[PDB]
């Protein structure tokens, strides 16, 4: 659905058609003007950063694995005459329709008997999904993946691509896949009895030399070398595929450009009258196009084990019954062609729709992981109460759309309750410890991170124990539309730290809420604060990120009693465009204001500009 | 966006069509009249400055690195041919106060002496014909037969730009494409080799009309307004901006011409920017000066223009310097505290000073710059009247030629009933 | 003063020069001005009583 994914984009964001991606990493964000202020008994110290960049790093890598599952049939496309008043295939009008057609008279009785099974095999979502992936593989084919590259680095802990993805050879996206071609046979109209477990599709005129090569590779096994997101592992959809084209199928060309795949899709949707099937395939790819680079080192727990993609079995019986498809189809919603028409016009807009969906999900799974099991709407039972339909199983797109509904705070409506796509909530529902690997840089690491060893020499491969999952992304596109006090994504905010002159700079934060806001605003002002917990004896640093530049409370990496000693004569000025706290006395009052917003994107440490219409 | 950048010019100034630029440096300002009145404890004194010239200096020198991208290069080819007699000398002055001096050897190493036409030697990309029947190469529509001259322009527009002299409209750009299909019913002619600046206008006007790429042109027009000219710094410290080099094609109309028909989807003022350029090409110079002034003024405190006008639009740096007088270390924050006339030293810049003073945007909104018309400083009370724009080029007056610019502009509605806000 | 000036201020008026130099001494700051015409120097710390 192009419509609901379009509304997620910000108001200030004015997108153009073409986006020239030339790398496997993009820093999308915005430039804002922050007017910071520090008030005290001595006096006020004002600062102003005219261009402050808040970013979320998004990559084209992510381990996924496809499995063939059984899903509901999509009945949109068939002629409106055969349907009854309620909206189900009234068999008796089918026998009437086949009799008054251009069919062979000896086949009518034998074909009508099979109709009861074959007419309820209508799901082309798997074919459109694979054909969409072939379009983007050939378009952005020049992107590279290096084996010994930096997946994450925060100074203390480093995580390489070798650690997360073993069995991985370095290669370009174009050179990753070597797809073998499936047989595309021509359907004989004078066949005695239809062959079930072999799908037959319709076509307009002659199947071109390039269309054979595309359909051949779409219905085949994806066995990748490099762990790319649009070239993940998928099983063999089918062995043979019939095509009811009176004009003969030309033999396989071998080569094809990305423009020839658009030609193949537009003919297939038009002939078969399968627009709702395409809408399902569009939302499936929107989830699994780009995966987020983790915000913190301990936020890599989401991407350790491979999340399963639910691809519905390829099943189509239009080739055997050409009469039942015509120019007057049955459809539920009137705006049923809108998703295809949007893709044909603006193909590259899917990148913006993809980041909008994953940013909406991973933000909400951040503040869903921080609720106790003893509650009404909790970790296990947040999907059931929200869903007001009849899906086969609460997985795939249903779990991702219900998280978007919670974020925006609106009612999302689909025509068919289809349950296909990636399932994200895997590591959450397990509710166990996850062991993420890390290579150390400094020697004073295991004070900050909950490491397995207490003394570790530099260049050693260690393990961090992550219990509660921290947020993987910070809200940027959904900034101050449905604000919560956890993220604290306000335009205006203030904090009042109360100290007396008798105290020699040392302040104890009994409250957890205002400790988070103090540590966050001090980082906007470019000050490196290092607090120490009095009960446990661990340490936390506000500089635990190089993208957003905010401090979330999950950076403590421990749930206990709140007694944070901060010494305010060890505050160090780190960044440029900063206000100085030389020597405070009395009550401190910090405050900021974000005034205007301008969309900005970065790639290879250079500006990435939007071009076209 | 013509109507946006046209608004930035002052209400009194209305420039003429043509402007014969014959140098790499242009002063622009106004001749105002100041009526001062002084009062203190000793007594009162009244005077009057009859003619006072307040001006900035803007140049065609700026180190930069690289269907909107195609129109961008086609526009750059137009101005290379038109103003293709501007000389860049390597051992010339960039800034000169009296104590310090910056040469063009410094700020621009890896440069030689060349004219603007002699800077680029562009190769030609293959312009092939798309035969109808074929079932990372763009295809564009065309009206009738592709002319012998039109081939050479499209060929050079797609090719790599590799300059010798640092010029603003000849900056380094990567190769757009290798091939470019043209769905022309009549076959294309082979490339001639030579073309006039007038022939590039004919190429742009046809390419936009056929493809209906009016909004793509508007993007390229604004994109060139930033690059076209660069500021000459106000003081020696304001050279810190221009040390590090600032960083600056797909179409499927040829394949599927059914998608582009007689009823296109569009603002109702979506053909104004092209209609403005095709009528008055030399007006871009004034729009460019207006834009780069607004940006570099507000950075002292791109679409910075909103912060300037106040309307809704829809590490220490090591500057290399030359010592002219022996007493230089007293004024500038120099590394070597003892110097000799001729020595090349380096000065330190921590906070970036303003590169330009408000001239066109003088008194539209006054900050405490203190660019008032009337002000009482505490006692000095002055009044500014009788503004008249004047431009100087190569220490002589540069006069505007041609006729008076008549307004072209379309209303918010043609025959549209309801404003579907969108 | 403007940011273009690197701390250096010239007092054309004699009245406000006297008030600046006096209030800076209440604040406990040792200012040393130099006359541009003659080339002599004046210090605000020229008394230990008032």
Swiss-Prot record, chain B:
Gene Ontology MF: a single term: RNA binding
Entry keyword Cytoplasm: no
Keywords: Capsid protein, RNA-binding, Virion
Compartment(s) of residence: Virion
A GO cellular-component term linked to this record: viral capsid
Biological process according to GO: viral translational frameshifting
Pfam families assigned to the protein according to its UniProt record, in alphabetical order: LA-virus_coat (PF09220)
Main location: virion
Keyword Disulfide bond: no
Family: Belongs to the totivirus major capsid protein family.
Role summary: Capsid protein self-assembles to form an icosahedral capsid with a T=2 symmetry, about 40 nm in diameter, and consisting of 60 capsid proteins asymmetric dimers. The capsid encapsulates the genomic dsRNA and the polymerase and remains intact following cell entry to protect the dsRNA from degradation and to prevent unfavorable antiviral responses in the host cell during all the replication cycle of the virus. Nascent transcripts are transcribed within the structural confines of the virion and are extruded into the cytoplasm.
Protein name listed in UniProt: Major capsid protein
